Design an enzyme around this catalytic site. Structure first.
Site, short mmCIF file in Angstrom:
data_model
loop_
_atom_site.label_atom_id
_atom_site.label_comp_id
_atom_site.label_asym_id
_atom_site.label_seq_id
_atom_site.Cartn_x
_atom_site.Cartn_y
_atom_site.Cartn_z
N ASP A 1 35.04 11.66 12.21
CA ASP A 1 35.82 11.88 10.80
C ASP A 1 35.32 10.47 10.05
O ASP A 1 35.02 9.45 10.52
CB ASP A 1 37.12 11.78 10.98
CG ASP A 1 37.80 13.01 11.90
OD1 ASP A 1 37.28 14.28 11.00
OD2 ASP A 1 38.22 13.12 12.74
N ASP B 1 42.74 13.60 15.58
CA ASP B 1 43.85 12.79 15.42
C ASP B 1 45.15 13.85 15.39
O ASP B 1 46.27 13.25 15.50
CB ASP B 1 43.91 11.91 14.40
CG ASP B 1 43.66 12.40 13.14
OD1 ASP B 1 44.00 13.50 12.88
OD2 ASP B 1 42.86 11.82 12.35
N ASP C 1 43.26 19.61 15.92
CA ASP C 1 42.00 18.81 16.51
C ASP C 1 41.83 19.16 18.11
O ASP C 1 40.86 19.02 18.82
CB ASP C 1 42.00 17.53 16.13
CG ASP C 1 41.94 17.07 14.88
OD1 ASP C 1 41.23 17.80 13.97
OD2 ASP C 1 42.60 16.23 14.38
#
Ligand SMILES: [Ca+2]
Ligand SMILES: [Ca+2]
Ligand code: NA
EC number: 7.2.2.10
Length: 994
Positions: free
Chosen positions: A351, A703, A707
């Protein structure tokens, strides 16, 4: 506690005698832990195949070896011959050395358990509780949670232990009990008791079952049961020690041990067979038994030398210490079976926000006019360091620090950034970090003036809370802002009308400070500021300014630019319409251009370097961001994922574009993609699937609850230390850092750990290989045996012990990140490696049988010197007219053996220096790189010396101190072992990999 769900909140609190407003005391915790143990399941026995087929096998061997020695120790009594002395202490010396071996064995095993122990410190503290200690919640390892203390659960958390809900702080508390009961549809809780004691978990909606996840709300509770006493632990107990599973490496190692257990056995049983023709020699008294016994002692002693011991211990030690360094750098890897995988990572999907990028807007460049002449101008360009809102960093001109007070233009630049601004900075004492208050784009300006500190205000000795806005305050005290002309989409800029502070000249020195998109602002400027003076704006000047703003907003940095200007003579407030923004452009006209700041959301520390490291290591980096495609690409050119000028309209995709592609294309996109923008959470899973469909070992960051699927699917699921616990549980690693650079460092350690294992294996196998051929090189030929049982055991103790262990402490290679990632499929030992083994050994094996044959053949200033056939030496007592003045028993001289054993030892101590790196020349990786290795080489050498120059000893092992002249014969025969390998290293480091 049992059936807590049945009792009430008051009852449960009484059970452990605790108020939910005080929590367990130290005395209580100490006792409960003692009585209830820790909250976890028991560690399963670790009896590997290696431990049985290697470790246990070598134990048996050394016992029957001692037994063989005792047999002949007894026969040496019925021997009416002369009462011998050397072979009389053999049994004792054997038992002795065996003791030494044990001492080393325990030392190694103690290093391993100690290294493992030093890991419990970094384990994630996923569990909050109230104890009588502090009057505030406390963090602690889930395993340290003893029934009774008060726990606090929140959204996105994982239930550490079985807990009875005491108080629900939020309006509702939903939980995800899918992992156990059977449904992801969150369940509602309450604090009322569940009367039926024999009720199913799905009915005990007043308990938080360990291993479940909080879907919403906040709640207080008390621990009912922990460890295997857990409701999940009593379902996870069916998997407790009843299992059959091993990592890919453990399977290769066992396969290796089992195949070593055969090679050793055979070659040794061969030694005893190819010598049956020596069972009746005179040197054995002509006994068809005492001769078979003597060789049996050699075949079993050679086995012991052969067998490479201490592997499990050394591996476990490297792994444990290696994981410590990872945690030391914020890479928390709970499961050791994961570092293996970590080391093979070939794709990192990351990310952007907070991991690759700091997510804290920062001004990194700024310029003001330097000089103006002939309608043309030069610019003073500056760069600013620091990448967070924190007032840390410095201003530089041509990469050299400078003081901003030195440029009057900068003093005004700072004035404008400090005043045309509705934001501020704030130091959060809790997090110990600076945070923004307002728009990020304005705070980058706030933080810039703090770093600029134009009035050299004293701050070095200020508080973190004071320092936050120190310099902005100084300015605000000199200038008073009386009102703001709100930003307008019409003009793309804003302004503040100001006057001098504490000034009695109400209508004197009034200014308007303007900030906004470059074009409009620049267009409304009739003047340019030079220092404190002003000159008219000219086309050439306007063109230069605009070009550098282009370069900055176009170059690899794509900085966001803001022009700052000042209306030197602002209109009268009485004549300003403050309720009609469409009138503001006019009020912000006739401006004087001051400067330009260029800002960006910069890459985290070491991110840009880590990215180049990845490329050097054949590890693909894929960015997943929320930005639009066009900017995502910018961000990739910025941090190094994409070159400055590189066509990437084929390696970057928005979720829209990706979803429009059919299956084979989507998969195709992933084998080459480097960037995914505006993507759906369900996309991470598809990406991982497609990546895996190409055999890529995948690392994926996450996070949140959304996910978990992808982090589970991925070989290396990476959760943010600052994210929810649900994600962390579903992963192999946690970035205490959140930093992408921490992932790359973790991959590096993983590779490093693997190497030390290989170097450790090379040294032991190559060396011991020679030891084996050595015994055969004299047997096949016919030369006189150059090593007796106790001598073999001596080599073993000296070369397979501390020196080998030391390699476990080898530093990270140099080309560690210059090699592609290892494939879990490839064999433990490659064909080129096996050749490298049979080559290094083949030498030491001969360099030994030859080191003694030298004493007999081309001897130097030494006896013997019968360089002809020594083959049929067992016939010297059949035809002596071949010798010229020497006794046949000269072949029994301790001279030869003393050489073969002194070479065999010093050469292996040399081969150990070849194992400091796999392919790096001792020239590049100096032998003094592993201090422990050198220290071990000493100890080993000292002991060999002691065994030669301490009168009682040299007679025991059948040896004799050699003079300064005979030792140099060892080096000139041992040092070339380095040369030989050093050459092979050249072959691989140049012709094999490159
Ligand atoms: Ca050994
Ligand atoms: Ca050895
Ligand atoms: Na995973």
């Amino acid at each position: 506690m049992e059936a807590a769900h049945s009792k009430s909140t008051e009852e449960c609190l009484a059970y452990f005698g605790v108020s939910e407003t005080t929590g367990l005391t130290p005395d209580q915790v100490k006792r409960h832990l003692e009585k209830y143990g820790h909250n976890e399941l028991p560690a399963e026995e670790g009896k590997s195949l290696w431990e049985l087929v290697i470790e246990q096998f070598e134990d048996l061997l050394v016992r029957i070896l001692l037994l063989a020695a005792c047999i002949s120790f007894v026969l040496a009594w019925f021997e009416e011959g002369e009462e011998t002395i050397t072979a009389f202490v053999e049994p004792f010396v054997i038992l002795l050395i065996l003791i030494a071996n044990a001492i080393v064995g325990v030392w190694q095993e103690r290093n391993a358990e100690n290294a493992i122990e030093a890991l419990k410190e970094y384990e994630p503290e996923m569990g909050k509780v109230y104890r009588a200690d502090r009057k505030s919640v406390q963090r602690i390892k889930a395993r340290d949670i003893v029934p009774g203390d008060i726990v606090e659960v929140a959204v996105g958390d994982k239930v550490p232990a079985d807990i009875r809900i005491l108080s629900i702080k939020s309006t509702t508390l939903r939980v995800d009990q899918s992992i156990l009961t059977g449904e992801s549809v969150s369940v509602i809780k309450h604090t009322e008791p569940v009367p039926d004691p024999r009720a199913v978990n799905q009915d005990k909606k007043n308990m938080l079952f360990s291993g479940t996840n909080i879907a919403a709300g906040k709640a207080l509770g008390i621990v009912a049961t922990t460890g295997v006493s857990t409701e999940i632990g009593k379902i996870r107990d069916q998997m407790a020690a009843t299992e059959q599973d091993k990592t890919p490496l453990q399977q290769k190692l066992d396969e290796f041990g089992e195949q070593l257990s055969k090679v050793i056995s055979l070659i040794c049983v061969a030694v005893w067979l190819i010598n049956i023709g020596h069972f009746n020699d005179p040197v054995h008294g002509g006994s068809w038994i005492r001769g078979a016994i003597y060789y049996f002692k050699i075949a079993v002693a050679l086995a012991v030398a052969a067998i490479p011991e201490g592997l499990p211990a050394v591996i476990t030690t490297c792994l444990a210490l290696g994981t410590r360094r990872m945690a030391k750098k914020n890479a928390i890897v709970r499961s050791l079976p994961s570092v293996e995988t970590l080391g093979c990572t070939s794709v990192i999907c990351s990310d952007k926000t907070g991991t690759l990028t700091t997510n804290q807007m920062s001004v990194c460049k700024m310029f003001i006019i330097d000089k103006v002449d002939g309608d043309f101008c030069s610019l003073n360009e500056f760069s600013i360091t620091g990448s967070t809102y924190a007032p840390e960093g410095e201003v530089l001109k041509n990469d050299k620090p400078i003081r901003s007070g030195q440029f009057d233009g900068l003093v005004e630049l700072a004035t404008i950034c400090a005043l045309c601004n509705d934001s501020s900075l704030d130091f959060n004492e809790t997090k110990g970090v600076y945070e923004k208050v307002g728009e990020a784009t304005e705070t980058a300006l706030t933080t810039l003036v703090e770093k600029m500190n134009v009035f050299n205000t004293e701050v070095r000795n200020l508080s973190k809370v004071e320092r936050a806005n120190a310099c902005n305050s100084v300015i605000r005290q000199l200038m008073k802002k009386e009102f703001t002309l709100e930003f307008s989409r019409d003009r793309k800029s804003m302004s503040v009308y100001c006057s001098p502070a504490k000034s009695s000249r109400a209508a004197v020195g009034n200014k308007m400070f303007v900030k906004g998109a470059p074009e409009g602002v620049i267009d409304r400027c009739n003047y340019v500021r030079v220092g404190t003076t002003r000159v008219p704006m000219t086309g050439p000047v306007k063109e230069k300014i605009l070009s550098v703003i282009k370069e900055w907003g176009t170059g690899r940095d794509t900085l966001r630019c803001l022009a700052l200007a000042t209306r030197d003579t602002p209109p009268k407030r009485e004549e300003m319409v403050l309720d009609d923004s469409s009138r503001f452009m006019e009020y912000e006209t006739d401006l004087t251009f001051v400067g330009v700041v260029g800002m960006l959301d910069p890459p985290r520390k070491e991110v840009m370097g880590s990215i180049q490291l990845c490329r050097d290591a054949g590890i693909r980096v894929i960015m997943i961001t929320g930005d639009n495609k066009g900017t995502a690409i910018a961000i990739c050119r910025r941090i190094g994922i994409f070159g400055e000028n590189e066509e990437v309209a084929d390696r970057a995709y928005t979720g829209r574009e990706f979803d429009d592609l059919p299956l084979a294309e989507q998969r195709e996109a992933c084998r080459r993609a480097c960037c995914f923008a505006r993507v759906e959470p369900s996309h991470k899973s598809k990406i991982v699937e497609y990546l895996q469909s190409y055999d890529e070992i995948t690392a994926m960051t996450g996070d949140g609850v959304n996910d978990a699927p992808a982090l589970k699917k991925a070989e290396i699921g990476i959760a943010m230390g600052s994210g929810t616990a649900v994600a962390k549980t579903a992963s192999e690693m946690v970035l205490a850092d959140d930093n992408f650079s921490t992932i790359v460092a973790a991959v590096e350690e993983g590779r490093a750990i693997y190497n030390n294992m290989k170097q450790f294996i090379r040294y032991l196998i190559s060396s011991n290989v020679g030891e084996v051929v050595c015994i055969f090189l004299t047997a096949a030929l016919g030369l006189p045996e150059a090593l007796i049982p106790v001598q073999l055991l001596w080599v073993n103790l000296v070369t397979d012990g501390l020196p080998a262990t030391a390699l476990g402490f080898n530093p990270p290679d140099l080309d560690i990140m210059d090699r592609p990632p290892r494939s879990p499929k490839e064999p433990l030992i490659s064909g080129w490696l096996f050749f490298r083994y049979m080559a290094i050994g083949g030498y030491v094996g001969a360099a030994t049988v030859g080191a003694a044959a030298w004493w007999f053949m081309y001897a130097e200033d030494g006896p013997g010197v019968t360089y002809h056939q020594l083959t049929h030496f067992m016939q010297c007592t059949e035809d002596h007219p071949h010798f010229e003045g020497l006794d046949c028993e000269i072949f029994e001289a301790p001279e030869p053996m003393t050489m073969a054993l002194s070479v065999l030892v010093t050469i292996e101590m040399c081969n150990a220096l070849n194992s400091l790196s796999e392919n790096q020349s001792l020239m590049r990786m100096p032998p003094w790189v592993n201090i422990w290795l050198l220290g071990s080489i000493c100890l080993s050498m000292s002991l060999h010396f002691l065994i030669l120059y301490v009168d009682p000893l040299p007679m025991i092992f059948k040896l004799k101190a050699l003079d300064l002249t005979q030792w140099l014969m060892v080096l000139k025969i041992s040092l070339p072992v380095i040369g030989l390998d050093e050459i092979l290293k050249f072959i691989a480091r140049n012709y094999l990999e490159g």
